[PDB]
Amino acid sequence: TLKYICAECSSKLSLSRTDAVRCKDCGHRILLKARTKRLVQFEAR
Amino acid sequence: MIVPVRCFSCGKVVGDKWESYLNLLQEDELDEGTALSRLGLKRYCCRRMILTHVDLIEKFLRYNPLEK
Amino acid sequence: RPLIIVSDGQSRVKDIHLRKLLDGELDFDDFLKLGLVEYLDVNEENDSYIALYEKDIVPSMTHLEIEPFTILGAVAGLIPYPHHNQSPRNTYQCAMGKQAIGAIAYNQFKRIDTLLYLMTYPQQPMVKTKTIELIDYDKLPAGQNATVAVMSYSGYDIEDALVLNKSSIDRGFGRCETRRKTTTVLKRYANHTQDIIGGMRVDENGDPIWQHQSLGPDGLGEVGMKVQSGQIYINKSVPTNSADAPNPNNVNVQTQYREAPVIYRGPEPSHIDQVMMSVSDNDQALIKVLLRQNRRPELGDKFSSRHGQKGVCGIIVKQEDMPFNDQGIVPDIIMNPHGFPSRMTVGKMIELISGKAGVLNGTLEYGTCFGGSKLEDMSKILVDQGFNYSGKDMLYSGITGECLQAYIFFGPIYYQKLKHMVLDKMHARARGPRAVLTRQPTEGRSRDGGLRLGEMERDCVIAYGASQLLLER
Amino acid sequence: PDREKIKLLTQATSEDGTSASFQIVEEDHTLGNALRYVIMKNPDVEFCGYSIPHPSENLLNIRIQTYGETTAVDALQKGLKDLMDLCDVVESKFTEKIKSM
Amino acid sequence: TTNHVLEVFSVLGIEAARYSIIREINYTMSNHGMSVDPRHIQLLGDVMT
Amino acid sequence: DEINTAQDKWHLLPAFLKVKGLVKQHLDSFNYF
Amino acid sequence: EIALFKYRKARLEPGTAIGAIGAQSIGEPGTQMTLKTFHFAGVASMNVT
Amino acid sequence: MSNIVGIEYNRVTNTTSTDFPGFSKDAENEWNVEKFKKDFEVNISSLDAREANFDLINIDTSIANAFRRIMISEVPSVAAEYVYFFNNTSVIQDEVLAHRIGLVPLKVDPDMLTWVDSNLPDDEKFTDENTIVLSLNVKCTRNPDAPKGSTDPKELYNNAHVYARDLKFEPQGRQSTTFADCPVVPADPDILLAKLRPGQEISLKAHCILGIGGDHAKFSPVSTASYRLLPQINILQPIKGESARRFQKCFPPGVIGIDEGSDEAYVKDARKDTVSREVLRYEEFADKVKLGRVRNHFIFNVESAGAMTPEEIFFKSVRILKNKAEYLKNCPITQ
Amino acid sequence: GNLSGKRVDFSGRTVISPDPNLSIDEVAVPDRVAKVLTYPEKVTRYNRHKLQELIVNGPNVHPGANYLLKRNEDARRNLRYGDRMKLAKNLQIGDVVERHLEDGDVVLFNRQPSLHRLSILSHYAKIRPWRTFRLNECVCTPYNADFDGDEMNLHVPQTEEARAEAINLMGVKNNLLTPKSGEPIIAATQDFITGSYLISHKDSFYDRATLTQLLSMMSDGIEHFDIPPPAIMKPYYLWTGKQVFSLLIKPNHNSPVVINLDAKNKVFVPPKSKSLPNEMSQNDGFVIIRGSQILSGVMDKSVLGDGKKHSVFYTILRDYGPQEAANAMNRMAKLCARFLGNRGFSIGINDVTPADDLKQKKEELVEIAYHKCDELITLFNKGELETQPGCNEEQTLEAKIGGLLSKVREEVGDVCINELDNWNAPLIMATCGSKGSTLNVSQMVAVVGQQIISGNRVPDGFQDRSLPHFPKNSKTPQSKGFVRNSFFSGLSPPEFLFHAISGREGLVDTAVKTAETGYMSRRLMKSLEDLSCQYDNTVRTSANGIVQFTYGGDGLDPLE
Ligand SMILES: [Mg+2]
Ligand SMILES: [Zn+2]
Ligand SMILES: [Zn+2]
């Protein structure tokens, strides 16, 4: 599902539940979430 | 943030007249009035769109989160 | 404050001292060493005698002031020509400029705080000030350059009410966005347990159910989706048995989770753009999600005028209305001309004249205090372009086609959109606690009664003499 | 035949023709003014006035009032046929100037 | 006539104290406009005494 | 072109705010502390 | 007829809460006071409230 | 009433047309189609691809205002209505970027489309003769041949600035040959919709339908549609000399002129006058000039957005304003 | 500890907006709060045909209902979870539904700083678009509305008996007067006055292409009008502007409205000082109305709208009921809103600039008054002066300089109005009603004068002087609080500080006044509360102890 994004090196990493939540490349302590792969509908008005 | 596509009052497309304005500012050095006059718009409406506009996206793209 | 010393006939700061200052060296603190300027105190300038300008050199003088418009502060320097208005309309604007919304910082998309408002297309002001270039207000402006025909139109503008233009706010005049924060923490209780997150339950081919169709496989609201009423954007479950302290045993009782998620509630739907995981200081998980909502101007949203002429929106008027000044410029906001004599803001009237003649020969003008652009040579710029010297244009009415029998003052004014929209103030209650129409919980020392019936309102219905309305209410 | 486009209000009209009112739905100041001018040029019509009661609706109340021997339901049909004639005059003189140049 | 109502009350009596209090209120309001249709002032000057 | 005196005196205020800032009343106290 | 009808309708109707009307008709002009220093004297002889 | 009007220094008089039978004792100016066909005519100053300027004489303000009003609303046009996004990972939010795709003008004839019926479900409103699909797919890439310095985002960044030319029309449905003669393009391909950085990608799909300009500003077929009454300067007491040259420095240089080796000034090409009435504050030019404008003459100046030619917008407005009058006379008046 | 207290069900609070197309007895409620604020209706013989469709429409469609209470009290079953079409089919005769708020329902409407009894009126409802409590501006004067984003409260009564005690003796049409003085407090307002001064101006002459449109914009189409013969004939058929207000009072023969008052308007010029007619004035002046026909005079604030006992709607109210006065108020309020957008009215920088003649008199006459006060300064240090008996030698110098500097601002303030050209906005707004006086236009154009604080002039901010820009022992007017520049020319920094002090004085006396918005009126309410007139024409107390034998000595209602 591609669940993690580092806030410094921006490496597309992902790990499962309770697996030492940090970055496996740099070592930053906070992580972002990527945009979904589904389809969102908007109105151009 | 970015230059608007249409002007607010009448609706003339001013989004096509920003890069050609910045080209006339740096090279072929003119003041803002004449270089904005020989660019299209005659009215002071739709002239206000290019004159009083701050470009925030050039400063916003220095904080790119998808790279380092 | 630092002032300039004079020595018994004239100023110490000569012409040769100021040529070096704008050419690199000999800056400030190199004028304190050479004895040209000095700091004076409040009870120490009582033993002084200060001139205002340089055409005032009397041999009985001791000091000379640097600038007269230093008396206005940092927020108070946003007003163009403050010495033409009256002083309460210079004070109210100091409470309205801080409430205006716009660009906040260069990392305003990179931070998560509890509430901030943004502007989609901010524009720098037409007439600047010599004190707004130093505080860098022209890099992060908060407002919109409208075009204003000052006239009475459609009758929905009687006192403190502006009418707006459809097909002008449809093209991005006043589009804002509101970002709110929801934070949760996953507590580690003392009796060896956690509160876990998860979900993804289905029911008869629905993938997932209606209350769940904003969550991913993790259980957090993914970026890009929309959230509406009672749908859940953070699915949280806490253990129901490990609240007290049952001292640690190896019994299998940890499969008891009573779920208690957070639920979005609101009139109009929002969108999820950021969610962040943290492993904060004492090894404890933190979840911060941000929800943004794009709002457009409507009936009830208030605006200012950079002079204290605050007012609410009256009606969004069609574009085929709003008389059109034969070249073809439709006004953006029409303002009632009756707000001028009782409030005495004529410095606003100069703002159009130094604004309409500022657009033409491509120069953003200066409306600084005790100076700025002179009204004499700004009407000369306005008159050789083919316009009136006083900005009065003649209009052609929209609903009837014929001319208007008075020349109508037309030109651009830097307006600005405030807080205090109508979408988060509509609060209603039918019966019982936890009212059905709940406003956003940001009061901040502003409890103005609420949905109550005070003793002052009980005394009004005694004066009518109604006895059964008392028992009903 | 649309029976909801134009109506005739009951508690506004007198007897036998004269002093009638009409309610037209989904209309703005365009046909109101362009039809107020043509019916006023009928020399038997002496009170022709349109109005919109509320701006966030789509109503148009037009009142036609004569003296006599012309029913106002016929005075509306007379001033609505002449607008077709004016639009025939406008698009015929304009087309030949595009053609001839 | 003095401004002090109790000074009139200690010398003149009850009935001469209300006739001063219906005009001292009438004086402190007619110096600004704001007519308060003096039957209201007479009702105020009667419930106090 | 030509340097005046009543107009170039204005330039004392930028050169004041470049050396010591506008938020110096909070910075200088914590730096002295 | 007009002079008798406008007088017969002008009487105070029984049941009117006339204390509540008189209490609000006095206090509501009282809530629009600024300072307004005046004097019942000559050239600034006395400061009166 | 009191013909060609006067411009006063503090007001303007004679506003109402008032040419109806009932203005005076004699029944003057009836309808008389044979008189209106004789008196009304049209001149044309210029016709360009996106700008038209023409004149109408002997005609009321009311129906000319009607034409000016329903040039904007009732003339239909096409614009982007619904936008479907894929992985928008740029800095612009997906409501701001969706709002700028609707505002661009598309260059296609709107007579090739059908009106959307809103009572149908979502998979049945859109069909072949109803929808124009546009597709955008831009991914930014770092340019490997980097220059000697970081100068501008044009260099050292491949396709960092998207444009309106990147909206690729997809041939939808079945009839991919009806639009094969003229595929739909924007009226100006240089519209900066977004700025990008590497790692970012915009992928979307827009469904363009037909609509009127009174519903939203994006369906407006014309940028500016307006008129001006022809001004007129009736000069009397023919003064000359240094005052004649002072009389010239006020007005624009092509509305009055000084004769070369002969007598006083005159009026030439009064069409180019923008009325600023600055000769009404001198006290030298008080009873020596008479400003005004003629009420019958109209100068229509239309500048379109680029979807259709401006010589079609006026004819389509006359056709629309004709059709709503014949639609009303064929309806029963219901009590 | 004497705060608000009670919490009331079925209420809302929303900001307010302008709407003169709405009547004076109505408040337009949006369809988002008129869906949870219900009204309990008992079903009977005369509502079974409506409540069935009302139940069938449901809670989401706006003409619908939310809850339902059975006759035998099963539960309070809501119309949301099941219970479709068949529930409206039975509908026993004792059932109580809770219907949505609809058009014509009695609702009371409040502003939270309630001063007097005209702060809580009652209205009818009207269901509208966007979410604000818009209302007419003829009724905003008792609420003290200055709209600018102010919130107001809205309460619906929940029974059949309290709903009748709001629309009969508490609503808008029954409370056109204030009980404080009997004057009309709730009447025509700001832009409805200047729209009446421009129609009834003497230089306005209409025609059947314009008069018909004016008559059709005041009664939104449907009204039968009888066109009078014109005041001008055979050259040009012209109807005057005073024949429009002559026509909206009495449109046709069916209305019995005959109005026969006469009164003088605002600022008035004597005709010839010999002529016994009061209406031969140089201006328009004195107003004659004889049989619903205006013979002379414009319609400003004195004749039309809020003010004295000689109003037009006051005469209609005393003579021909409250409903006809309400109809005439609605008619003029929707006339002026349509007319003033088509006439055009602006102010601009042109209407504030002195025309090169006032500047010479300002340069001359002020320097005459500076010389006649500076001679008292050089006489003050010549020992003593002629001391006035009311004060000492120091306060007799303040009073004379204050009197001369108050006299200099009115002799300049009256030579500016005479050289001021007509057809401008602020002189018309000072000649007519709503806002602006001669003081405001003389303070914009000619001169601002003598910024005073706390009664006297400004004191010494430093030792022996006010500002450090003036010498010690300087009692000159430019040093001690006399500005001399108008707002068009621009203030000097000592003039700017002197104006800022006097502005912040009056600005702080308003913010602290909101803490004392009802403290005297509530304490006075403690005793004057339980007093009512009995049926023996005596006003008594609650314990029947008599307090006054007849009210005011004569028993007359000061309202009527
Ligand atoms: Mg307010
Ligand atoms: Zn990392
Ligand atoms: Zn424009």
Swiss-Prot record, chain B:
Family under the similarity heading: Belongs to the archaeal Rpo10/eukaryotic RPB10 RNA polymerase subunit family.
Keywords, sorted A to Z: DNA-directed RNA polymerase, Isopeptide bond, Metal-binding, Nucleus, Ribosome biogenesis, Transcription, Ubl conjugation, Zinc
Predominant location: nucleus
Organism: Saccharomyces cerevisiae (strain ATCC 204508 / S288c)
One cellular component term from this protein's GO annotations in UniProt: RNA polymerase I complex
Subunit composition and interactions: Component of the RNA polymerase I (Pol I), RNA polymerase II (Pol II) and RNA polymerase III (Pol III) complexes. Component of the RNA polymerase I (Pol I) complex consisting of 14 subunits: RPA135, RPA190, RPC40, RPA14, RPB5, RPO26, RPA43, RPB8, RPA12, RPB10, RPC19, RPC10, RPA49 and RPA34. The complex is composed of a horseshoe-shaped core containing ten subunits (RPA135, RPA190, RPB5, RPO26, RPB8, RPB10, RPC10, RPA12, RPC19 and RPC40) where RPA135 and RPA190 form the DNA-binding cleft.
Top-rank taxon: Eukaryota
Cross-linked residues, Glycyl lysine isopeptide (Lys-Gly) (interchain with G-Cter in ubiquitin): 59
Binding site for Zn(2+): 7, 10, 45-46
Keyword Ubl conjugation: yes
Protein name (Swiss-Prot/TrEMBL): DNA-directed RNA polymerases I, II, and III subunit RPABC5
UniProt miscellaneous comment: Present with 5300 molecules/cell in log phase SD medium.
InterPro entries given in the database record: RNA_pol_su_RPB10, RNA_pol_suN_Zn-BS, RPABC5/Rpb10
One term of GO molecular function: zinc ion binding
Cell location: Nucleus, Nucleolus
UniProtKB/Swiss-Prot annotation, chain E:
Domain of life: Eukaryota
Cellular location(s): Nucleus
Oligomeric and partner information: Component of the RNA polymerase III (Pol III) complex consisting of 17 subunits.
Other known facts: Present with 6020 molecules/cell in log phase SD medium.
Job of this protein: DNA-dependent RNA polymerase catalyzes the transcription of DNA into RNA using the four ribonucleoside triphosphates as substrates. Largest and catalytic core component of RNA polymerase III which synthesizes small RNAs, such as 5S rRNA and tRNAs. Forms the polymerase active center together with the second largest subunit. A single-stranded DNA template strand of the promoter is positioned within the central active site cleft of Pol III.
Protein family according to the UniProt entry: Belongs to the RNA polymerase beta' chain family.
Designated name of the protein: DNA-directed RNA polymerase III subunit RPC1
Organism the protein comes from: Saccharomyces cerevisiae (strain ATCC 204508 / S288c)
Gene coding for it: RPO31
Interval of the full protein contained in this chain: 1315 to 1363 of 1460
Curated annotation (Swiss-Prot), chain H:
Coiled-coil positions: none
GO biological process: nucleolar large rRNA transcription by RNA polymerase I; ribosome biogenesis; termination of RNA polymerase I transcription; termination of RNA polymerase III transcription; transcription by RNA polymerase I; transcription by RNA polymerase III; transcription elongation by RNA polymerase I; transcription initiation at RNA polymerase I promoter
One Gene Ontology term, aspect cellular component: RNA polymerase I complex
Keyword Cell inner membrane part of the UniProt annotation: no
Keywords: Acetylation, DNA-directed RNA polymerase, Nucleus, Phosphoprotein, Ribosome biogenesis, Transcription
Protein origin, superkingdom: Eukaryota
Protein's cellular compartments: Nucleus, Nucleolus
Residues recorded with modification Phosphoserine: 17
Entry-linked InterPro entries: DNA-dir_RNA_pol_30-40kDasu_CS, DNA-dir_RNA_pol_insert, DNA-dir_RNA_pol_RpoA/D/Rpb3, RBP11-like, RNAP_Rpo3/Rpb3/RPAC1, RNAPI/III_AC40, RNApol_insert_sf, Rpo3/RPB3_RNA_Pol_subunit
Residues found modified as N-acetylserine: 2
Keyword Membrane on entry: no
UniProt GO molecular function: DNA binding; DNA-directed RNA polymerase activity; protein dimerization activity
Disulfide pairings: none
SMART domains: RPOLD (SM00662)
Family, similarity comment: Belongs to the archaeal Rpo3/eukaryotic RPB3 RNA polymerase subunit family.
Remarks, miscellaneous: Present with 13000 molecules/cell in log phase SD medium.
Name of the protein: DNA-directed RNA polymerases I and III subunit RPAC1
Phylogenetic lineage: Eukaryota, Fungi, Dikarya, Ascomycota, Saccharomycotina
From Swiss-Prot, chain I:
Record note on what altering residue 153 to Q does: Temperature-sensitive
Residue ranges of the region described as Bridging helix: 493-505
Signal peptide positions on this chain: none
Subcellular localization, as worded in the UniProt entry: Nucleus
Binding residues for Mg(2+): 146, 148, 150
Subunit structure: Component of the RNA polymerase III (Pol III) complex consisting of 17 subunits.
Family under the similarity heading: Belongs to the RNA polymerase beta' chain family.
Protein name, entry field: DNA-directed RNA polymerase III subunit RPC1
Source organism of the structure: Saccharomyces cerevisiae (strain ATCC 204508 / S288c) (Baker's yeast)
High-level lineage: Eukaryota, Fungi, Dikarya, Ascomycota, Saccharomycotina
